Amino acid sequence: GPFQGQRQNEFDLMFVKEIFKNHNSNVVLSPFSVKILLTLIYEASDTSSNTKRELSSVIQNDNIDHTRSYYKQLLESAQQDNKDYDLNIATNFFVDDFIEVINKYQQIANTHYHAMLEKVSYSNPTQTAATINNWVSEHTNGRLREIVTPDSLEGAVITLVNVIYFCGLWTYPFPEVANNVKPFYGTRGKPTNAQYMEQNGQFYYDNSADLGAQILRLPYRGNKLAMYFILPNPDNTVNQVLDRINSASLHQALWYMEENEVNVTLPKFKFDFSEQLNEPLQQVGIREIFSQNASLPLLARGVRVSRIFQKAGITINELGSEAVQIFNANRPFIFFIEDETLGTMLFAGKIENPVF
16 A cells, blocks of 8 residues: 655655756656666765765765665665566666776676666767667667667767666556547647546545645555556646645645545556756756766776766556546646655656657
């Protein structure tokens, strides 16, 4: 069942806010993985000053040994090998040839953050882009195929790349209704038509006057993973609910959710999203690790990260992902997937127009 603790998402939601307010399309990312990226970058700096201050909300109590077992544990729970779903989170440093990579940092990277470093030649932008993009395919089973093009590597010394993959089954699937199309009344444009799936059942639900939105919980098998949909109220937009969501406003709204009989109508969707995270990371104040006086002494022998790339994909259908109260998601709505044993925000996204 649902998570009864307190989530460490003060930063995760700050970051979601920034992305969502810069994209009038569908979005999907992994806030937990962005935190892994920022901590791999902390491990590599000599501060392991301002960098210390800016990463306050990502590092556990200025004690590296806790940072590592913390992020190591959340990772192991999410990706725990079970017979009901498969979730994989993968990070890799693509390092230019003239950079001497320290083995112990590779050792840290593999052990505590499920990460790697790999040597490439940016002198052959095509062979390198090929190597990255085939790795992206190797560790997402083909769900994702490409994240960089040779043009996006210009000036690249180090390119930090993170993706995430998910395949799971609903505890309670929907009936197949071949011909179940209805309107979707999004913000931009005239309405559109989208494929829906319907069922009635017992699900955690609540209507939050605080955030002015409804909340639904759809669980996956494996006794670990559940998907939350947050659908604003008819008189309210997505950006309006966001401006109200913080760590405590969101904690209370999910606590109020107990099972009720729900009529659930949800638009099927299938898509993927990518952004280069340097520019939004500086908007939320993480700027020091991007200055010209920025170093990586514990990664390379005495340079910074050139570009940070992340990409995820998400699907929901009648059987899952990659497979009386009314919750009728026929307008824009937010979603996220969470490790319900610990509250890790593995996925987070939004539907501005659901296509499949």
